[PDB]
Amino acid sequence: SHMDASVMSTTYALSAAQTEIWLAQQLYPDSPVYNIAQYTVIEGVIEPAVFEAALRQVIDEADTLRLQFIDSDDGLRQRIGTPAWSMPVLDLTAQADPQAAAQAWMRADYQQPVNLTQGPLFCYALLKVAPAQWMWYQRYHHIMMDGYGAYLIAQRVAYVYSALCEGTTPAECDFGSILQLLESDAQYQISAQRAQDEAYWLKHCANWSEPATLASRSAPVLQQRLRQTTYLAIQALGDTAPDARRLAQFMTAAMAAYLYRFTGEQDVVLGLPVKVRFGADRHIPGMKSNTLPLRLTMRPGMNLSSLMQQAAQEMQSGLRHQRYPSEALRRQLGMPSGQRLFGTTVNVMPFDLDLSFGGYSATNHNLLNGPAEDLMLGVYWTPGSHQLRIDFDANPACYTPEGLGAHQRRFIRFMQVLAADATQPIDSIDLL
Ligand SMILES: CCCCCCCC(=O)SCCNC(=O)CCNC(=O)[C@H](O)C(C)(C)COP(=O)(O)OP(=O)(O)OC[C@H]1O[C@@H](n2cnc3c(N)ncnc32)[C@H](O)[C@@H]1OP(=O)(O)O
């Protein structure tokens, strides 16, 4: 079959991270849990023709957006292809409730599983929800985009659209090619760097135990996350974290403390999503992120400062080795097939939420952030702002909306009490 020879000749292997997504997606091919999505609210007038010109330009510039996947006897393969696509424009301003109609439209798209060999793998759409209020909806499959990549694209699209609105030529894009991302990952897989990283992680999680969880059960995730959202003032942590790093340290320390106070587990392993973007990888939209195991030991009557100490140590030791995939680590330690290294992940996203489109201000709002195996604490923070957005994303098989809400309210309060006195022992604090 010359047809099969040609597909193998004209394609590239998936990266390790892409492969892990592909395998998980194959387990539940009808589950939409690997869709990621957000919308950008623009407080102004958008011209859809110019917006679509900007999207065409960024689809040329971010070639991950033109990735095509083709199955082979040696697994899924990819190439820079020729996806057909369109930008729907919906004026919902005459609806009884335009905001709800916009949410319903976006949800109708992101609830649908993407077929990886047919696409479309992304969706871009414009939804007018009030006079001078527009929403730009962005949806991706996780195999070809992660959070930082989506952030890079939204920034570029805002920039290009603003230049085209002004009638000037957009300055040259600084994105690299997804091909160089793939080649660098291919070299990592056979690298001595990876052998070192693996050694560190095997030594680090030498032996384990069932992860502390807030649910009555552990189950695979098949449905879209249950989400509870709270907006919090960053005054409520003091100056504990004027820093993305220290914010991640505080969020992990607090979540570990909550898990201990609620479950009695003293060895709490959390998942810490990381970007895995050094050097040139910082400018290549596509799928790159990893999730590290982060171990926090709850000593007798220890305080918040101690826990944050411990978390900072874990981060400063393990972040250098962040390229080693956590599922590779799982397999290599020889764990039971279905059992995780962590159930609760702490996803801190210090990405600027603000944009400007044609002199009009805009803000980003997450809709989907990946699968919620158990519980994921998503934290959105524009560096410098005094405001955080905190999501509890949970597996619907393991949590109820109101149980999750009660946990979030208890945790938010607990968290504010901890940051109100980092020296207080965590056993000594009442919780709702
Ligand atoms: C469409 C909707 C979009 C949203 C969908 C999201 C879907 C997803 O699930 S994808 C995941 C999204 N989440 C993320 O990307 C997580 C981002 N957050 C984080 O990475 C962590 O929380 C955070 C904030 C602690 C990372 O902290 P950060 O300071 O950036 O560390 P990082 O840049 O990774 O590297 C630092 C360490 O790497 C090590 N390192 C190794 N090599 C190098 C190198 N060449 N250069 C620099 N550091 C290196 C060093 O030890 C370094 O430590 P230090 O700077 O102290 O010397």
Residue numbers in the entry: -1 to 430
Please give sentences taken from the publication describing this entry.
After our initial attempts to cocrystallize WT RzmA-Cs with acyl-CoAs of various lengths failed, we noticed that the R148A mutant protein showed strong binding to C8-CoA, as evidenced by the high ΔTm in protein thermal shift assays and a Kd value of ~300 nM measured using isothermal titration calorimetry (ITC). Thus we selected this mutant for crystallization, and successfully obtained both unbound and C8-CoA-bound structures. The unbound R148A structure is mostly identical to that of WT RzmA-Cs in two conformations. However, the C8-CoA-bound R148A structure shows only one conformation (in the P212121 space group), which is “tighter” than both conformations of the unbound structure, indicating that the two lobes of RzmA-Cs may close up to bind acyl-CoA substrates. The CoA portion binds at the “donor” site of Cs with its loading arm inserting into the active-site tunnel formed by two lobes, while the acyl chain turns nearly 90° and extends into the N-lobe as the R148A mutation opens up a pocket between the α5 helix (where the R148 residue is located) and the β sheet. In addition, this structure helps us understand the conservation of G145 (within the “HHxxxDG” motif), because at this position in the C domain (starting point of the α5 helix), the residue has to sacrifice its side-chain to make room for proper binding and positioning of the donor substrates. We first checked the residues near the tip of the C8 chain in the structure for mutation candidates to expand the binding pocket. Four residues, Q36 on the β1 strand, Q136 and Y138 on the β6 strand, and M143 on the loop between β6 and α5, were selected for this purpose. On the basis of the complex structure of the Cs domain with acyl-CoA and of both in vitro and in vivo mutation experiments in this investigation, we revealed the binding pocket of acyl group and the key amino acid residues that control the length of the acyl group.
